[PDB]
Enzyme design. Sequence first.
Site, PDB file in Angstrom:
ATOM      1  N   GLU D  49      14.887  51.764  63.177  1.00  0.00           N
ATOM      2  CA  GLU D  49      14.855  52.309  61.853  1.00  0.00           C
ATOM      3  C   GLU D  49      13.810  53.447  62.126  1.00  0.00           C
ATOM      4  O   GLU D  49      12.741  53.341  62.739  1.00  0.00           O
ATOM      5  CB  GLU D  49      14.873  51.691  60.543  1.00  0.00           C
ATOM      6  CG  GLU D  49      14.940  52.392  59.667  1.00  0.00           C
ATOM      7  CD  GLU D  49      14.440  51.625  58.282  1.00  0.00           C
ATOM      8  OE1 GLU D  49      13.452  50.823  58.215  1.00  0.00           O
ATOM      9  OE2 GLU D  49      15.357  51.906  57.428  1.00  0.00           O
ATOM     10  N   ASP D  60       7.888  55.187  49.531  1.00  0.00           N
ATOM     11  CA  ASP D  60       7.183  54.504  50.842  1.00  0.00           C
ATOM     12  C   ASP D  60       5.972  53.716  50.131  1.00  0.00           C
ATOM     13  O   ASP D  60       5.263  54.520  49.579  1.00  0.00           O
ATOM     14  CB  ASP D  60       7.306  55.025  51.664  1.00  0.00           C
ATOM     15  CG  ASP D  60       8.574  55.377  52.605  1.00  0.00           C
ATOM     16  OD1 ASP D  60       8.866  54.209  53.239  1.00  0.00           O
ATOM     17  OD2 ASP D  60       9.025  56.426  52.539  1.00  0.00           O
ATOM     18  N   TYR D 175      20.739  46.369  54.000  1.00  0.00           N
ATOM     19  CA  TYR D 175      19.392  46.280  53.909  1.00  0.00           C
ATOM     20  C   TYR D 175      18.899  45.290  52.866  1.00  0.00           C
ATOM     21  O   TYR D 175      18.968  45.943  51.552  1.00  0.00           O
ATOM     22  CB  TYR D 175      18.846  47.695  53.821  1.00  0.00           C
ATOM     23  CG  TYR D 175      17.445  47.624  54.071  1.00  0.00           C
ATOM     24  CD1 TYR D 175      16.307  47.040  53.575  1.00  0.00           C
ATOM     25  CD2 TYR D 175      16.789  48.536  55.270  1.00  0.00           C
ATOM     26  CE1 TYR D 175      14.897  47.198  53.839  1.00  0.00           C
ATOM     27  CE2 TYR D 175      15.475  48.596  55.537  1.00  0.00           C
ATOM     28  CZ  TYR D 175      14.585  48.011  54.645  1.00  0.00           C
ATOM     29  OH  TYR D 175      13.091  48.018  54.962  1.00  0.00           O
TER      30      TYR D 175
END
Lengths: 396, 396, 258, 258
Positions: D49, D60, D175
């Site tokens: 990834e 993030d 995911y």
Amino acid sequence: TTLLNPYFGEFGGMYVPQILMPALNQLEEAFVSAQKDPEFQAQFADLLKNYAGRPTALTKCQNITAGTRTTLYLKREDLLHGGAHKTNQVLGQALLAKRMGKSEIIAETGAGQHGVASALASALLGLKCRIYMGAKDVERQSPNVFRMRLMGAEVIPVHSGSATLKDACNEALRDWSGSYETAHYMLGTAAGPHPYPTIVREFQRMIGEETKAQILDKEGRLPDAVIACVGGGSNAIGMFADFINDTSVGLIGVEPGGHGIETGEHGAPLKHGRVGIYFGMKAPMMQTADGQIEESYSISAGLDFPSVGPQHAYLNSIGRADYVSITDDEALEAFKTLCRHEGIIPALESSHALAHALKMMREQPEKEQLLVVNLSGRGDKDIFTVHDILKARGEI
Amino acid sequence: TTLLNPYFGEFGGMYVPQILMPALNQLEEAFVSAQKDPEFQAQFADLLKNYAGRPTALTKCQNITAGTRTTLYLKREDLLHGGAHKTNQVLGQALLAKRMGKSEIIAETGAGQHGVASALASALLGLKCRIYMGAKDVERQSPNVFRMRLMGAEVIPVHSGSATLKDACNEALRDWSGSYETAHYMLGTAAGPHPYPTIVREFQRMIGEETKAQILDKEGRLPDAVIACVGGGSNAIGMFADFINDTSVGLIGVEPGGHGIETGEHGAPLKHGRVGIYFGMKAPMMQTADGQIEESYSISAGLDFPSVGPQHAYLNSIGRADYVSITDDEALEAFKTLCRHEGIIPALESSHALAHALKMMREQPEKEQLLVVNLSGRGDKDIFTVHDILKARGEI
Amino acid sequence: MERYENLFAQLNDRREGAFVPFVTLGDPGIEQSLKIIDTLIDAGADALELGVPFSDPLADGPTIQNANLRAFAAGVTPAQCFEMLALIREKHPTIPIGLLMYANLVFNNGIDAFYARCEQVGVDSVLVADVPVEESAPFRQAALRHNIAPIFICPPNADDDLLRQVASYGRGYTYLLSRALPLHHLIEKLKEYHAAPALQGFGISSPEQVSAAVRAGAAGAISGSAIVKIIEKNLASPKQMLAELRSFVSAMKAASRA
Amino acid sequence: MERYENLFAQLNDRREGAFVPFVTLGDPGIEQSLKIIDTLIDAGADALELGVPFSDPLADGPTIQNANLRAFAAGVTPAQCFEMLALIREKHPTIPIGLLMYANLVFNNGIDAFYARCEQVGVDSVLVADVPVEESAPFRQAALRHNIAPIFICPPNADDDLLRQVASYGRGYTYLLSRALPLHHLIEKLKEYHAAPALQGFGISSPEQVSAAVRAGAAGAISGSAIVKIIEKNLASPKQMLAELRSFVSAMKAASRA
Ligand SMILES: *Cc1c(COP(=O)(O)O)cnc(C)c1O
Ligand SMILES: *Cc1c(COP(=O)(O)O)cnc(C)c1O
Ligand SMILES: N=C(N)[C@@H](/N=N/c1ccccc1)C(N)=O
Ligand SMILES: N=C(N)[C@@H](/N=N/c1ccccc1)C(N)=O
Ligand SMILES: [Cl-]
Ligand SMILES: [Cl-]
Ligand SMILES: [Cl-]
Ligand SMILES: [Cl-]
Ligand SMILES: [Cl-]
Ligand SMILES: [Cl-]
Ligand SMILES: [Cl-]
Ligand SMILES: [Cl-]
Ligand SMILES: [Cl-]
Ligand SMILES: [Cl-]
Ligand SMILES: [Cl-]
Ligand SMILES: [Cl-]
Ligand SMILES: [Cl-]
Ligand SMILES: [Cl-]
Ligand SMILES: [Cl-]
Ligand SMILES: [Cl-]
Ligand SMILES: [Cl-]
Ligand SMILES: [Cl-]
Ligand SMILES: [Cl-]
Ligand SMILES: [Cl-]
Ligand SMILES: [Cl-]
Ligand SMILES: [Cl-]
Ligand SMILES: [Cl-]
Ligand SMILES: [Cl-]
Ligand SMILES: [Cl-]
Ligand SMILES: [Cl-]
Ligand SMILES: [Cl-]
Ligand SMILES: [Cl-]
Ligand SMILES: [Cs+]
Ligand SMILES: [Cs+]
Ligand SMILES: [Cs+]
Ligand SMILES: [Cs+]
């Protein structure tokens, strides 16, 4: 001779040089006429509402009184255009100037708040405004000086005598003694010679008139007490005036106790001075044994005057109004409390009134009482003063 | 799925990580319910009136338009508690937090004005408020930081990434992604993902509703145009919303032109950016050719955002609203003009709206026009900025 | 007040105007002030006007605002001013002494007691700068009970009511400020109303202004600030101060003479 | 997306989990990033990834916020990231390459053109961090037209509607963030709905977490920030950086093996 009594009992009068008496008589005449004139009243009402934002809110403060039998309302003069009650009466006096055919306003300021109020009224109504300022004050007060000049007022540095307030006031009155045919002297409090204590009260009385209507609507009765800080006396007499004949309503005026009455570093002449004659009036003042006028002190510039309006001295004398003092430290704790519990940053002046109401609640928390504090102004102007004291005592 | 359309034409949406969608759905649900709930509406009305001071005055400005066929009114959001329109919608969002059973408010601020508004609403309503702030911003903004902490808000310095707004916002949303069961994220403008652009409009729409009622009472007709500055879009959509279906009323939004559109140093994405996806929404933004989000610029911190609310992009696209820009120098001249001719010190944000109205008048002084400027805030906060620019160009 | 009567009778028999200088007591200190005052008298002053330093003298121009500050800087008090006045009278038995006071210093320990102290030290008149005739009753009453003339200002903006009040209530002299009815008219009307003799107090800084005041029908002139300017000017050389004061007063007095 | 099918088929025949490290392309510069990625593969990464530096990465944590800043400091652009991706694919023909993108970089020059460029350089999947399934239509359509798997996050706050949408719309892998329905339940339900094989992406920083993910029924684990912490930690010694990355990936991959 006058149209109106220049005295409140033994206090007040017109202790000015002879040359200023025609100016005071002219102003009394114009005021008495204006009070009869529906067009004057309609113009004043129009400016108060559409320019200054009246009526001002009456805020119930639940967090600050929780667990007590005190109900506390704040009359929100802090929301008035300019961020204090001073705006009400400068608009009225600017209309009186225009009534008398004048094109010029004179004022003086130390800290700058009355000078800003004078300058905003003069800019709105197309009056030429000159504001006398001690050179040492001009140095201190760059933001108020900048606001005044932004609003087109000519700020005159005074270097004569001690280069301060009393020196700026001397120059202002000297100018007025020569210029009163074209210029109005816009006195910033309910003090000085007749007719100023009367005019300033009548041009602030909407504070109490609104408070009465709002408290009757919200609670169905009058307050147990109304509470206001006392520098010269204008916001307090403006809150008091409409309740004077409601003899069940307590009238409490709060003077600045400064470092403590016992220190001598205070601004509480009504309770801790003695009667003298100065600034045009017979009134309580702070003075030396041999009759020199003392320097007052308060954390709050707006309260730092060694005298008081004569109508307050009179109301005290007959027992109609009661006067107390609140120290710098008590005002600072009220300032912090209102910020944290109501999201309102009060003027340090107003924080003296709130501190006494908090004392009334805390001393007797099971006493049922309905209190109104006059929140005379907003405290944006005070955050650097408060910041510096709090960091200098280790954030206490 | 949602209850309401998340888009205005092609603009808006919910461009958030999946983990935040339940938080946005919960808030949409609570808002739709609250809009149906007379008790919510009554509580909100009570706070707006008795705490914030609504309704705000509508001021006719005669000196500034003399000799033209322009009639100019100022909607006085500068007189609202806190000194800007931001107060309206933080009170509504704090009531929504309480509706959803939350006890905590999250916000971020750079310049500090939304953080102060968030902190005052949280102090009033007994909510724990945390405000994320870039370490470099905490350094710059000592007075706003002090006001926030005075009001009991925990101001969290963010040192992560570039130690600034985008870094404070990242931390705030990270916290919210974990805390949304107990904490409400109080977004400070009519932007971000659905439902924030909708909520913020509905919690600001009293600006226009009052303006319509006041202009009908004073003039007996609707305005030719209403004019507002556009940072994220809240004060402008709050003025616009109640006039959208009055198709004779012009809606003019003013973006910050900064140093000049041609310099690239501006905050005018609606007219000079291009559509992208960021901060939860598809909207005009300032970006590099390769799709990085650019840094905006304006003399006024409140307008300095490289994007805009999606409802403005939509109103522009269909030709319902028109968007223009005003440079730093034009805003400064409007700031000086209002101070000198009306005794009102406007926020530099609001000075952009006033500058465009002055342009409309001056360009076509024989054109009969009835204009309302939304005076989104007071300019006390801006006097040091204005002072420094004026002394640095030789008092020009 | 009898000293003023005797003075004006003596001047009238000489067809002569009065010249009356003003100074602040204790400016620039007590000893130099005593010497200044003796120099004013030796030079031909007919009477004196003497100020007592006050914290807030709102009625005085800049020259006297600064005289007041020097006298404070020297720490001069009202009690020391009254000691100075006793010493001046003890040296000079006939010269009329007038005080220029602010109301607070008169009211401070009792109005009556203030005028009693004036009488004890041999003061002849008191002008209270911030007491208009409308407020004057207790001041003029206390003055007269202690044989003190109450001095009133007749300003340039006077009307007929004010001329009659000043004429009725005043003694010693009328303090005329022709800073607005003509000079001729005011002096004529004060005489018609049997006022105390008029001293012109506006802008008297040159000999020609003293002669003009006498020619207009006034009994004399008061130099309200020109004497104080000569002190302010010579603070570094006390001896030159006294020489310039003597030559200025000599010239101003010569201008009053037939 | 075929590379993921082939990988999972091969791992299933070995009773083996996937280990998938994440890194930011060009952190801490382009050449060291290319060496880092080759070291991750040589150490046993099953797939990659890879993040493209973006001005405003709101989705993030701090470790990746700081990786993004280093890559900006080196001046790394999307065009340079796509040159890097072509070079990685040209070296490694079978390893699945997935991108972690922000919507603006995908939308900037046209969504379709973005996925066309992904296909040209040999990318297998794209996860757009700020596009929830509710907004995904044009992204997943463009992805599938260019043979790119669209990767969806199944968060800990998923409901049944979200499991069915993720199961229906995703390809390549699901995911999984088990940061709230049990882990067991989510993996079981995704399998029941014929979702793409699940990779656990929450808190994978130790070998025991990789074994636990496989034991729970997931096809493997993604180490979302632990690889980036090892770069942040060794910026001064590039050689030690590569040695610590190799020993970390070797250990994490060993944990996936039967
Ligand atoms: C000026 C001022 C005062 C004191 O003046 P008063 O005449 O005694 O009312 C008090 N509060 C505020 C906020 C002021 O600005
Ligand atoms: C915050 C602010 C603005 C800009 O925000 P909008 O959401 O675009 O209204 C404008 N004016 C003032 C005074 C503000 O405080
Ligand atoms: N002008 C003066 N000298 C006198 N002050 N007079 C005033 C006139 C108007 C307002 C306030 C004061 C005085 N001595 O009090
Ligand atoms: N949390 C995130 N990472 C996303 N931001 N999400 C927001 C949620 C609420 C208000 C504003 C933004 C995003 N990538 O836009
Ligand atoms: Cl009395
Ligand atoms: Cl009338
Ligand atoms: Cl003007
Ligand atoms: Cl002057
Ligand atoms: Cl004042
Ligand atoms: Cl009534
Ligand atoms: Cl009623
Ligand atoms: Cl007390
Ligand atoms: Cl559209
Ligand atoms: Cl309901
Ligand atoms: Cl709280
Ligand atoms: Cl966080
Ligand atoms: Cl904001
Ligand atoms: Cl209606
Ligand atoms: Cl109606
Ligand atoms: Cl434009
Ligand atoms: Cl002294
Ligand atoms: Cl003698
Ligand atoms: Cl005088
Ligand atoms: Cl009479
Ligand atoms: Cl007589
Ligand atoms: Cl004199
Ligand atoms: Cl870059
Ligand atoms: Cl390979
Ligand atoms: Cl992610
Ligand atoms: Cl589906
Ligand atoms: Cl699938
Ligand atoms: Cl990841
Ligand atoms: Cs209570
Ligand atoms: Cs006081
Ligand atoms: Cs006009
Ligand atoms: Cs903007």
